[PDB]
Amino acid sequence: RLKEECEAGSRELKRCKEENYDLAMRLAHQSEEKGAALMRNRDLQLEIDQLK
Amino acid sequence: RVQRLKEECEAGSRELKRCKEENYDLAMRLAHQSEEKGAALMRNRDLQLEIDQLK
């Protein structure tokens, strides 16, 4: 009754910890890509301001 | 032995609850950063089109 639910919980904890590491890596990757896109945006806005 | 595995199981159920809450937070922050990157790339395309008409 509780032995089976506790074995299932420890397997779910193993998967949750794997997902946590995966989410952290994906978050760091998206933050770098967002930073690169925003830098390109600043440079383009500066170009427009000089022409207009 | 019975009381030891009971505690260990209760501790794991609490750690899983914590991990799922952290994972939900990371997922929402990941979704936010991806949306912001996407929005910036779309503005970049529009700005490049504007520049090409002015130079």
Q: What string of DSSP letters covers A3-40?
A: HHHHHHHHHHHHHHHHHHHHHHHHHHHHHHHHHHHHHH
Judge: B12–A6 Cβ closer than 8 Å, yes or no: yes
Does B54 reach chain A within 8 Å, measured CB to CB?
Answer: yes
CA dist B21 and B8 (Å) reads 20
| Structural biology method used | X-ray
CA dist A42 and A37 (Å) reads 9
CA dist B14 and A29 (Å) reads 30
Judge: B30–A27 Cβ closer than 8 Å, yes or no: yes
Resolution to 1 decimal place, in Å: 1.8
Roughly what angle, to the nearest 10 degrees, separates helices A2-51 and B2-54? Answer: 20
Judge: A41–B37 Cβ closer than 8 Å, yes or no: no
CA dist A35 and B9 (Å) reads 43
